[PDB]
Amino acid sequence: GGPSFPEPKVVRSQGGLLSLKLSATPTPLAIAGQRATLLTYGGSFPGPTLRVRPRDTVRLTLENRLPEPTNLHWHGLPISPKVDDPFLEIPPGESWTYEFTVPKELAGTFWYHPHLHGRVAPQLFAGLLGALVVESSLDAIPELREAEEHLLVLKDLALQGGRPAPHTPMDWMNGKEGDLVLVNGALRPTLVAQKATLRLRLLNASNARYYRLALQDHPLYLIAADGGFLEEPLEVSELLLAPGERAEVLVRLRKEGRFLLQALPYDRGAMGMMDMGGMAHAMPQGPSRPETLLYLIAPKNPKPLPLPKALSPFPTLPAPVVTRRLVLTEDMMAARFFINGQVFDHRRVDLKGQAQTVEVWEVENQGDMDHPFHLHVHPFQVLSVGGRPFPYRAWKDVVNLKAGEVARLLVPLREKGRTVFHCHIVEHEDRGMMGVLEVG
Ligand SMILES: [Cu+2]
Ligand SMILES: [Cu+2]
């Protein structure tokens, strides 16, 4: 009812259980005024949103109907790596049931996508992604209960011959960006707000595109990062979301009107093909062209809600027991990507840590591109980048590093088992930039 807005179908837990059979299948669909066959979960692009509460049981059977093997990564979920198994392979025509319990303190926006090494980037680019939302008791406070809530899945695409465009040699180096810059699988949808306060859950599920988000005439009020709430709302004029990151923001519409949500120009250090003359400068690709993501129409006579004064206190973490250094490097022309000078080997354990301890990880980008570093299974707290303090306290699982930046991360080691860390420009992961962590 009311005005329509494209948004994935939601599947909710019931009586403490979300049991769902999800097929990964090629699917002809309508897209930006044409028809294309994508790879999809549940026949939709994006895939369906799974919405759960803490302590729920999730029983997701993944039915592989693809021509190639696949698996799922439960991105951001602090569960067992024996469930969130980055080494599992589900052959074509086979199924696998993922069963886990949602942790008691968890809240926010998470997502699921393929993690079969070597094939992540084509599979994710072809459409295999969906969101997972964990509801919180905090969502009941009046300042959030009465906000108009929406999920915005930021994911671009390019098509050739009615199918996802093939990966080029340049895509393996830079990561693939598409010419169709979509929101919830739609080209520049219009959202006609019925409330003056919106709560937008934001997911960057793109292979490589960055989104320097800005809303015309409006600040954003950040209330959640990748893996949970901030301690209190943080007003920002704009918000950069790297591949794999999520955020939740409140928007306070003060005036009537139509306002563009844009992805402003951002230069992530992608490299262009080489050229003659024009002098001026060199041959980086330079900043992205600005893109309109959606149109937001304010309701009549808008009166926004007050902001909540407080959200969730961040747990104090114990003193760390060990410091690690992880150096990211690249060989751009070979399109190979390294951590501490090595490419991923699934039979090599790179770091051995202890369950129930906290470590400090120093992640150093010695490349020229932005690399967004992701660690499975163990959410972390970012302390500093470039020697300066991170602007808020919240659980993160992806941290963006620009050329030369060093992040210092507090990593509490939770579940035992073997898991991975990798750049979330997924082409770089496929081309080497991944290593193996074992917790005992
Ligand atoms: Cu991910
Ligand atoms: Cu990278």
Side-chain angles (χ1 to χ4, degrees):
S4 193
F5 181 69
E7 198 158 351
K9 185 195 301 319
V10 178
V11 169
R12 298 168 207 274
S13 64
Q14 292 214 211
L17 177 65
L18 200 166
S19 184
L20 172 62
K21 192 184 80 167
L22 208 69
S23 307
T25 313
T27 307
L29 302 153
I31 186 95
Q34 61 207 105
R35 257 181 105 70
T37 300
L38 310 187
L39 314 175
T40 68
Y41 302 117
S44 53
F45 168 70
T49 291
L50 320 181
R51 192 151 170 139
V52 297
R53 314 177 52 253
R55 306 190 70 151
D56 278 351
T57 293
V58 173
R59 287 215 269 270
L60 186 299
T61 305
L62 173 59
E63 205 179 63
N64 181 4
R65 298 301 180 251
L66 306 166
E68 45 182 293
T70 195
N71 71 17
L72 286 185
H73 173 35
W74 291 93
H75 182 131
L77 281 176
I79 59 179
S80 167
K82 289 127 154 81
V83 180
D84 188 31
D85 185 346
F87 314 100
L88 178 84
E89 165 159 335
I90 307 170
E94 305 303 317
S95 303
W96 184 263
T97 299
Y98 293 93
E99 177 153 14
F100 60 90
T101 300
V102 179
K104 74 143 281 203
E105 326 99 281
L106 193 65
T109 308
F110 307 86
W111 62 306
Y112 59 95
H113 68 76
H115 203 261
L116 196 136
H117 179 245
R119 302 167 166 116
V120 175
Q123 281 187 10
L124 182 50
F125 195 76
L128 292 157
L129 62 137
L132 186 143
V133 174
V134 182
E135 304 190 338
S136 164
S137 62
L138 211 43
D139 297 335
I141 68 172
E143 301 78 0
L144 304 172
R145 172 192 78 220
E146 298 302 315
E148 172 172 333
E149 184 187 350
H150 296 275
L151 173 69
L152 305 182
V153 178
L154 309 175
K155 177 152 188 77
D156 56 341
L157 190 61
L159 306 168
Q160 175 189 136
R163 297 193 85 105
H167 265 65
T168 70
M170 294 282 292
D171 294 327
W172 292 115
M173 173 184 76
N174 282 328
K176 193 169 187 54
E177 301 183 63
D179 61 303
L180 308 173
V181 185
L182 300 168
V183 174
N184 291 342
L187 192 59
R188 306 187 273 274
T190 291
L191 169 51
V192 187
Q194 294 215 251
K195 299 273 197 46
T197 293
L198 304 129
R199 186 229 187 124
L200 306 180
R201 303 188 191 248
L202 309 164
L203 162 65
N204 182 349
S206 304
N207 278 38
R209 180 178 289 274
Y210 281 64
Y211 298 87
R212 185 187 162 210
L213 298 163
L215 184 58
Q216 279 183 341
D217 290 326
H218 292 86
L220 309 181
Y221 296 90
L222 186 65
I223 68 174
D226 302 327
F229 286 108
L230 272 65
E231 303 196 289
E232 65 183 345
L234 180 65
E235 178 191 8
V236 298
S237 66
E238 65 184 61
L239 179 67
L240 180 73
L241 283 189
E245 291 186 311
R246 294 85 64 211
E248 304 190 7
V249 301
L250 301 169
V251 170
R252 310 176 79 259
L253 300 173
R254 294 214 110 204
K255 44 183 113 201
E256 290 171 29
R258 171 193 291 112
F259 309 91
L260 277 66
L261 178 70
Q262 288 179 110
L264 302 177
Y266 184 78
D267 182 4
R268 69 186 179 88
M271 277 315 292
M273 194 37 101
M274 202 259 160
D275 190 64
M276 301 263 108
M279 260 280 194
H281 61 108
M283 203 39 152
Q285 264 188 18
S288 57
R289 155 183 97 102
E291 299 283 0
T292 298
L293 293 177
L294 56 80
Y295 307 103
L296 179 64
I297 301 197
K300 193 182 111 63
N301 182 37
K303 303 164 133 153
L305 304 168
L307 294 178
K309 311 160 181 291
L311 300 158
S312 288
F314 192 79
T316 187
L317 295 176
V321 314
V322 79
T323 302
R324 305 202 186 262
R325 186 151 277 257
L326 293 183
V327 193
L328 316 177
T329 56
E330 60 212 21
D331 177 340
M332 288 290 284
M333 193 174 76
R336 284 292 154 128
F337 301 92
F338 311 83
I339 302 179
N340 287 340
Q342 322 192 268
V343 296
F344 177 71
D345 186 338
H346 76 286
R347 302 160 146 146
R348 188 180 73 232
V349 176
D350 299 316
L351 313 173
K352 302 172 187 271
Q354 294 194 83
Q356 307 310 101
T357 66
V358 182
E359 317 191 325
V360 173
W361 287 22
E362 300 180 345
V363 193
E364 182 185 358
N365 182 1
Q366 282 182 17
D368 297 313
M369 305 180 72
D370 282 40
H371 297 283
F373 180 87
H374 176 50
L375 170 62
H376 293 203
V377 170
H378 318 273
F380 51 73
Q381 183 201 359
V382 190
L383 311 183
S384 53
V385 186
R388 291 170 281 266
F390 208 68
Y392 58 78
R393 284 214 293 187
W395 292 113
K396 282 188 57 55
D397 50 62
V398 175
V399 58
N400 193 54
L401 313 157
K402 307 185 217 285
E405 296 195 323
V406 184
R408 281 177 48 249
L409 302 310
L410 269 182
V411 185
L413 295 183
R414 311 196 186 182
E415 294 279 352
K416 292 152 187 245
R418 187 169 306 184
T419 186
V420 294
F421 48 88
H422 60 88
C423 180
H424 218 292
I425 293 166
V426 287
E427 285 84 358
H428 297 176
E429 176 202 328
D430 277 346
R431 303 287 293 181
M433 205 181 253
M434 184 156 59
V436 171
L437 161 69
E438 189 163 60
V439 180

